[PDB]
Every structure is written in C-alpha cells, then in structure tokens.
Symmetry: C3
Subunit: 308 residues, 3 copies
C-alpha cells in the first residue's frame, strides 16, 4: 500500500494551456489527505520539469519531457510502489506505459478515453501529439521521432494486450488503424448495449484470460460526459456517466493487479463548480470544481474507496 | 445508396408554428454535406407546397397537403431510393407510411415517440391531428375525413405490423385504444427494464420474425429527452438519452431493410445551443442548435454512420 | 382502495427548516386530485401537531412528536387503509414503521435512500436524529432515548426483513454497522451493475421469498439524483434517475402488498421550477416545482398509475 505520485505537467501535446496546472490543482484539492484516509502511504516525487517525421507539433519539448518522465517513473516502479502519473495531456502516457512495460513485461493496458489517440503523424488532422500517443506506444509509427532516440530500443506495447474503453469520437483514418492493428476496443455503443460492468469484464477476460497480469490504467477524463467532467479540452457528447466511471474504477481496483495509472487531460481552467453537497465526504476541499473533485474520487476508487 | 429528400413543412397538425422551418434548417445545418460524406447520393425534391368528422382542426390544409405528399413520395419510392421525409409535425406520417405501404405491402413500421398519436377524433382532448396520425394510418377512424377522399381506397397499416417505441405520455382514452387494437408497444419502462438494445431486438423479432420485411422508421424527435432535444413542441420527462437514440438508429440501419423514414416535430425556434465540441465531427455547421445537430446525426446513423 | 393521508411535519431530526412545509405543499400541488383520478378514496387526517443517551439533538420534540404519530397512525392502520405518511424529515419513519409492524408482524421494509440512516448516537458525526432513524427502528440503540419511554415495549424491525436501496453516501462507522447487523443493502453500484429492475426483484426475493408479506416503503427523496430532485436537504451525487425511481415504485405497486409508505425529506424551499411540459398530465398544479411534482407522481405510481 505505497503509492508514488508523479506530476507530469506536459501541455505540449495539444493546443491549449491549462492541463499543466492539473497536478498542483489536485494536490490543492486534497490528494494527500485522500490517500491518507484510505490507509495508503505516499511518496510525492513532485513534478517533472521542462527518415524522421517533421510534422509533429512541439515534438522537441515532448521528447525531452518524455525522457525525464521515463527515467523518473522507472525509478519509482522499481520500488514496487503503485505509481500514479498525473498529467498533463495524454502525451505523458508514452513514457508512463513504456516504463511500466519494461518492468512488467506482461502488462495489460486499459485505455479509457472518448478518443482513440491512435493517429500516426501521416494521418493526423491536427499534428497534435496527444492524438497519436497510443499509436506511438503500440509501435505503429513508421518513421523516427525527433528527440525520442532514447526510446528506440524499448519494448513497445502490443495491441492484443490492450483494451480501449469508452470511445465515441474517431477520425476517418483512425477507424482504419483501429481495425488494422487488431486492438481490443469497446465503444460507448457496446457500453450502452451491455452495460459498463459486462464491458469491463469482457475486456479483462479478453486481454487477461488467466487473471494473472499486472494492469496499467490510462484514464483520459474526457471519457466522462461533459455534464460531470467539463474541465477538459476535447469534449465528446454521450460519455460515461458519474455512476459508470466510478464503477469502472472500482472493478479495476478489485482485480488487485493495478500497478500504475495515468490521469490525464484534466484542465482546471475549464472546470466549473456545483458545488458542495453532503455526499462530498472524502477529505476534498469544500466547493472544489467538479472535474477536479471527480478526479480525486476516481483515484480513491483505484485505492480501494467503496460505498460500504 | 440513393436517397430522395422530401421536405414536408406541414404545421397544421398542432397549435404551433416552428416545425415548418425544420426542413430548411436541417439543409442549412449541412444535410447534403452529411449525406455526401457517408458515400450516399441524394436527390433533393424540395418542399411540398401548400358521416364526416367535423372536429379535426385545420383538416382542409392537412388533407390537401397530404394528397400532394402522397403523390410526390409515391414517385420517389418507385425509384427504389431510400426516401427521407422531413417534417413538419407528425401529421406528415400518414401519407409517408401509406405511400410506402402501397409499394411495400409487407412494410413494418417502427414508430419512435414519447406519445401514441393514437387518438381518434371522438377521443382527442385537443382536436390536433398530429395526436391522431397513427390511429388514422392504422385504419382506426370510424367516420370519413374531409379532404381525405383520395385516401379512402388505400390499404391501411395493420397494428400487428407496427411497433411503438419510447412511449411515456398517453391519454386515458389512448390507453384503451392501444390495448384494444393490439399494436406492439414498448414504453420507457420496458426500455428501463431491458435496455434499448434488447427492446428493439424484441420489437423486430415480434413484427418481423423472419427478418425479411422492409422497414419504415417514423421518428418523432420528442421521443428523446429534453436535455438533448429541447427543440420540439410537446415535451415529456424521462425520454431516450443521447446514447440510446443513437444506438437505436444504428441497430435499425444494420437490418439493411429500412426503405423510408420520417423525421418529425423538430422545431428550430424552440431549440438551444451548446455548443461546438470536438465530437461534432460530421460536416455539420459549427455551433448549430443541439436538436438540429442531433437530427442530422440520427439521419447519418440510418445512412450507416458508426463509431468505428 | 382507501388511503389515509397523514401529514408529519417534523423538522427536528436535522438542522434545516423547510421539510415542515412539505405536507401542505403536496396538498397544494394536487395530492387529493391525484388520488381521486386514480380511483382511490382518501381520508386526510391532517397534520400531526407539536443510562440514557444525552447526545441526540432536539430529542424531546422528536420523542413527543413520535408518540403522537405512533398513536395516530396505529388508528389509521386498523382501518385496513393504505397509510401514506408524508414528512417531515426521515425521523418520522420510526413511528411509521413500528406502528405498521405491530399490526403486520411479517412486515417487510424497503428503505429507499442515498444514505443508511444507520448511525447510533455514539457514532453519529452530527447528532442529527434523521441520520440514526433506521438504526433506532432496527433496535440497534444501546441506551434508552429520552421521551421514547412509550416505545420501549414495542417489537422492533429485524435487519433480515429489511432492504436498503440506492445508498451511496455512508459514514465510516455506518459501514461497519451495516455489515455487522446483516441488513440487506443494494448500493448505487449494484444498481449500475444489474439495473434497478433486477435489483428490486433480488431484494424482494431475498426478504420475501414466498411473496406473501405486507410491504412498507420508506422513501427518502434524496435517493433520487439532484437533477430531478433538488428540493432536499442532503444531496449525494450519482442518484437514481427519473426513469429508475418511477419504475421502482411501479414494481413495488405491482406486488399488491404495499400497506404503508413514508415520503420524507422533501423541502419545498430548496426546490426549483422546470417547468410545465405536456407530459405533466396528472392533475398536478401547472408549473409546480419539480421535486414536489415528482413526489406526487411517485405516490401515483404506488397507487397504480402506469403508462398504459
Ligand atoms: N483525433 C484528434 C483529437 C485527439 C484528442 C486527444 B484526447 O484523447 O484528449 C487528433 O488531434 O488526432 C483530431 F480530431 F484532432
Ligand atoms: N395526445 C395529445 C398530444 C399529442 C402529441 C403529438 B406528438 O406525438 O408530438 C393530443 O393532442 O392528442 C394530447 F394530450 F393533447
Ligand atoms: N450520516 C449523516 C447524514 C444523514 C442524512 C440523513 B438522510 O437520509 O436524509 C448523519 O447525519 O448521520 C452525516 F454525514 F451527517
Ligand atoms: Mn486521450
Ligand atoms: Mn480524449
Ligand atoms: Mn408524434
Ligand atoms: Mn410525440
Ligand atoms: Mn433518510
Ligand atoms: Mn437520505
């Protein structure tokens, strides 16, 4: 029951600033108090500081940042702590997943997101890296990436060992990439047809038939509907509701096999207040903005927080 | 993959004006671009222009309009195009369904609505025709209708070949008519108990056991909850949510047997903006009002639009 | 088909005033007209007027009020009327349940609530009685309660004959009490996993395997999500939605075994307007505040109100 907290305030994977403030905002809202009350011990490492493709925006900053995060997280993982990586945009998942994968070769990744993030630079509509991060992590890039030389000899994630859950906003080329690489995916329609519980059980059974693999959760908060999670840069209608995302995290916690996690794309500057209702019982700051509060509750779920 | 577009801006079936603007509003919002991107070809026919019961309001206008729509739609159906009929209030479904039925004698009708629209003139609380249209289409009227003489020798729809889905606001007399005529109906409670997916599968199995019949979809947008579809005249609490209505249209598309469709009761003057989120990816006008945008997305679903 | 209406405007179980106005507000909104239209006859009894634990707030007022309610309700129950007890805060359920239990020894109680209300005075964070009422009713109090001497020789409710449904906001000590006393409980997560329909069927099968016991419903309106029921003092995120709470009441009605019911924690002063949509068809006042209107609709469900 030891968790290493890493702040990864990288905002170079997408147009906006805001996500760089997420790590410190979650601390201000009561991250430490929340971990404390759940009976976990924490070590807060602070914040990470900061032939070829020529069409990825801000790639130098991203590459340099990613090397630092990779080295820092590798060191935390070796402690056999649960490692919590708080972004930052989804670009931080590359170093997070790959560092975890080098240590846990049989890692299974649950990528929770409204989007695929599975564009490659030659298909990206935006040139924004956070929309390509999963494709990069899966070894789908065809050329070398500037400032990622340090990563060229790493073992990459395999599509068959991955499940994407909650998707609903996929680009034309992405649809082809998704089908082609044979990754396991579960759309909001699958969730509507079968329910979130059956969906995650199906995903876990598919990627971990013997229920014996370590799990990495990469949670993009925009997987959650705008009604509950307005504090995020790229919104897609018809997301996971409050009950669903909480149950999902609870089920993953109950595997007892989660070793690491990203929580990405929380943007405090975009967030809104409700606020304070009696049900906000975790030691979270009164009247906190709703997405920030949700983030802390979802982290609590992963650490074992339950209704009774 | 050819669709005929018919605009049927009839607003005489209910008190309000507004629905007469729906057809041109959906065009303005990008109907043609949406059809184009889905790989369909369209032919836009433009807009329809315009002993006995003595208690149906505006019946002359409705009767004259309906003859025109019947003749126009009959001509489009004979092309073997998919025919998309955009209202207008639900009154336009009489000529739509009956023209389709004369060509496709084994037509099965899916009537998606918060309401039954199954009043007869002697039971109607309002005298508004759009609340009687289904009863009229099913041959339940007991007397002749002024200005509907042209229709008297048509074959009418049979209750056993029809399923009503999403109902929740039914008048006292309607409850009796519904049970008496033995139509297949699936209330919002059936949907809550079994889910939208099981519900539509059950309905399709009930009316088309051999999965070999052409299907007509009559979609009243007020079947969808007010949160997602405020742009409509008669709202009923507890409607289909965004995920449900999208999944429903997707499942119907996947039968590959839909030959015609109404989209009715969209009233732009009542609609609201969100607006523009990244997930609005179809070539729909930026910041479009939400019900109009939903209408275009649901039309896209019927034309094969899917998440991946 | 006779219902006795008892108004129990007790507001001493929790900090706020407001719930004392609930009984008269529901009457103003059309309680009598609603009962009339459903084919029931009513008798409106009006409103109840008004070694030891030393740490329960306002306990004198509560104790004196409860004796009056117990005596009044006992008299109504003996008529073999369905008895509808409208609070007031949840404190009124003690006398309601116990009076019903003395007459119906095999009573089964369905406690619908976001909260457990299962604190004992030595574990209560607030000293507010409405957060202890279920624990008191179940005979879990260890010391005597001032001004409750009249109740000391009553038969108490048994945990195994009770089901709590909808819970999501439980205090640390309550979690232990819940598990220890072996009460049947169904959290919002159970509801999300299985659906409200399966959940209530499971609960009824568990507490009444032979489907032959009289049922008491204790409905705290804060079980319903804030979106639909803002008019209440203690809100918890992720509640029952509009469709779910309506279906739940419908299923309980359909047992044909409900003999009594509480509707508690409605606070008109906290309520909001929508308002008037066509679907508000029950004889409820136009533009009524939404929680009040919901309360009347849920009472109607229990009295047999259905979609068709
Ligand atoms: N696919 C998009 C957006 C990706 C969203 C990133 B996220 O998961 O928060 C891209 O940039 O490649 C495209 F539409 F712009
Ligand atoms: N049944 C009502 C309303 C019908 C709603 C039409 B719709 O489906 O949009 C009627 O007019 O017969 C009645 F309550 F007024
Ligand atoms: N458990 C609480 C609140 C109870 C809510 C009562 B209700 O069901 O409306 C208590 O007072 O014991 C605590 F957190 F303050
Ligand atoms: Mn992402
Ligand atoms: Mn995303
Ligand atoms: Mn209609
Ligand atoms: Mn309707
Ligand atoms: Mn309560
Ligand atoms: Mn409560």
């Amino acid at each position: 029951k030891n968790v290493s907290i890493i702040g990864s305030p990288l905002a170079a994977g997408q147009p906006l600033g805001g996500v760089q403030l997420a790590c410190d905002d979650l601390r201000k809202l009561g991250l430490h108090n929340v971990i404390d009350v759940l009976g976990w011990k924490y070590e807060d490492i602070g914040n990470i500081d900061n032939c070829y493709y020529d069409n990825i925006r801000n790639i130098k900053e991203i590459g340099i940042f990613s090397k630092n995060l990779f080295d820092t997280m590798s060191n935390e993982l070796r402690k056999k702590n649960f490692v919590l990586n708080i972004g930052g945009d989804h670009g931080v998942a590359f170093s997070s997943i790959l560092s975890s994968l080098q240590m846990y070769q049989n890692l299974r990744v649950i990528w929770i997101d409204a989007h695929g993030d599975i564009n490659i630079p030659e298909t990206s509509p935006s040139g924004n890296y956070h929309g390509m991060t999963l494709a990069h992590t899966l070894g789908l890039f065809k050329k070398k990436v500037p400032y990622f030389e340090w990563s060229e000899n790493l073992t990459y994630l395999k599509p068959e060992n991955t499940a994407i859950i909650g998707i609903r906003d996929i680009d034309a080329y992405e649809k082809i990439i998704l089908k082609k690489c044979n990754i396991n995916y579960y759309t909001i329609f699958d969730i509507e047809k079968n329910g979130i519980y059956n969906t995650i059980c199906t995903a876990l059974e598919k990627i971990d038939p013997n229920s014996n693999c370590p799990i990495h959760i990469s949670l993009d908060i925009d997987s959650v509907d705008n009604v509950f999670a307005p504090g995020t840069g790229t919104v897609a209608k018809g997301g996971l509701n409050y009950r669903e995302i909480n149950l999902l995290m609870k089920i993953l916690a109950e595997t007892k096999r989660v070793v690491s996690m990203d929580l990405v794309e929380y943007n405090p500057s975009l967030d809104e207040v409700d606020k304070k209702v009696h049900g906000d019982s975790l030691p979270i700051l009164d009247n906190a903005t709703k997405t920030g509060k949700l983030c802390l509750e979802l982290i609590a779920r992963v650490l074992g927080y339950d209704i009774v």
